[PDB]
Design a binder for this molecule. Structure first.
Ligand SMILES: Oc1cc(O)c2cc(O)c(-c3cc(O)c(O)c(O)c3)[o+]c2c1
Length: 446
């Protein structure tokens, strides 16, 4: 009997959403090389993932429209390109299905999609195939989308530090931690925010929701709450397949530099690639790092080097490293690094907790506030920076708290505890090993 299993994959075709979904498909393709996997991205998303990278033969790549007509020049806001792609609707997605079906000579039996591509559910219902939502964001933020009205009401009437006790297992979350686009109503509403606010109705229609995290780190009561909202909640280990890793030269020499530093002494600073921080906070970070006297690695966009204080890089050159790029995963897995100063992106938090690195948190948007709140008040593996924004005096204090002070021993200890929890979670028989097979069974039973 000919194997006719054909999984269509729909990533949210942007930056940090692309690698974790490729990582999952690679694992699925390795264990089911008889099954066809059709990865359907845009021209720019495909170039990002597959330019110089060898992929298994049962994974084929197809290209659909990015929603940007030739001639148009999107503004300098990270939402427009998202809205433009989402505006393409299911019809653009079905054009990717056409290219997949034509190539493989197989009708799609299953669809795995990033939860943000809500149009792919209509596609799944049209084809009558199971729809599997993939969730590479902050896991604990899944609960929010089932209580939008409760949250919108509380965010307008209650205090900003009021607890969201109506969320099982997430009573530490506050009004000020809630994503802004979830509260935005009317003119401020984007196609992106309207899509995210549809998750509470969209997600229960998914055959399975695959979370890119460790189930053992999430609050058990939150987990049970989500299992009560969904047909199936599956956790697959977010750690990279060796098929995903593209080994490259450490051009900056971060690791060689880190080897000359002592254990848990280095501050690693990075705000991500989507985040455009105010120049004054950028000035404040440099000022704090310099005053603190701690060794540091700061991954900073070169477009921001002119913003840096005069002589800062030159004066800190003997104890600090300011570079355009770092192999972050290798840096966070280095023993010299004592604190991760982060914007709290889901992947960065993942890499920091799995390596036992405490965090200084400055969330900017989205679900970074949820991550930061979990890091400080639940896992207790870090602190939100003093004042919610970067200042010289507040940041230095956070740096001193985590790195050297006895008042930060509970946090450094908790970071080691969490690392051990992760190491057992990724074991041969943690929850994810069982959940990975369940997902494989869903695909082979489709
Ligand atoms: O409220 C939220 C909750 C979430 O989980 C989010 C996750 C995300 O990845 C993004 C996101 C991703 C991008 O690549 C962008 O260019 C951008 O402007 C936003 O926004 C989010 C907003």
């Amino acid at each position: 009997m000919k194997n006719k299993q054909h999984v269509a994959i729909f990533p949210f075709p942007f930056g940090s959403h692309l690698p974790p979904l490729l990582n999952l498909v690679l694992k699925l393709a390795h264990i089911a090389p008889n099954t066809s996997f059709s990865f359907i991205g845009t021209h720019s998303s495909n170039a990002f993932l597959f330019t110089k990278r060898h992929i298994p033969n049962n994974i084929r790549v197809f290209t659909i429209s990015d929603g940007i007509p030739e001639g148009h020049v999107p503004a300098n806001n990270p939402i427009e390109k998202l809205d433009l792609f989402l505006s393409t609707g299911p019809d653009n997605l079905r054009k990717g299905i056409e290219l997949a079906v034509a190539e493989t000579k197989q009708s799609v039996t299953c669809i795995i999609a990033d939860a943000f591509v809500t149009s792919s559910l209509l596609v799944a219902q049209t084809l009558n195939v199971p729809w599997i939502a993939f969730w590479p964001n902050v896991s604990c933020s899944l609960s929010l989308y089932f209580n939008i009205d409760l949250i919108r009401d509380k965010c307008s009437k209650d205090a900003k530090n009021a607890t969201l006790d109506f969320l099982p297992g997430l009573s530490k979350l506050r009004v000020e931690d809630v994503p802004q686009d979830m509260l935005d109503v009317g003119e401020k509403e984007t196609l992106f925010s309207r899509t995210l606010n549809s998750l509470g109705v969209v997600l229960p229609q998914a055959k399975a929701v695959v979370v890119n995290f460790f189930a053992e780190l999430d609050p058990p009561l939150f987990v049970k709450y989500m299992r009560s909202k969904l047909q199936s909640l599956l956790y697959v280990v977010p750690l990279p397949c060796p098929q995903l890793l593209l080994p490259e030269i450490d051009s900056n020499g971060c690791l060689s530099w880190l080897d000359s530093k002592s254990s848990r002494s280095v501050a690693y600073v990075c705000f991500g690639t989507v985040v455009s921080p105010p120049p004054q906070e950028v000035v404040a970070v440099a000022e704090a790092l310099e005053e603190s006297g701690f060794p540091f690695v700061w991954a900073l966009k070169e477009s921001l080097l002119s913003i840096l204080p005069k002589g800062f890089v030159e004066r800190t050159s003997t104890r600090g490293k300011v570079v355009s790029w770092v192999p972050q995963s290798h840096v966070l897995s280095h023993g010299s690094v004592g604190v991760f100063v982060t914007h709290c992106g889901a992947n960065s938090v993942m890499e920091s907790v799995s390596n036992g690195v405490p965090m200084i948190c400055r969330p900017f948007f989205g679900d970074q506030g949820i991550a930061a709140r979990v890091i400080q008040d639940i896992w207790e593996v870090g602190v939100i920076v003093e004042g919610k924004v970067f200042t010289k005096n507040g940041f230095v204090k956070s740096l001193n708290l985590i790195l050297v002070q006895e008042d930060g021993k509970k946090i450094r200890d908790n970071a080691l505890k969490v690392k051990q929890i992760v190491q057992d979670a990724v074991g041969p028989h943690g929850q994810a090993a069982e959940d990975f097979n369940t997902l494989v069974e869903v695909i082979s039973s489709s």
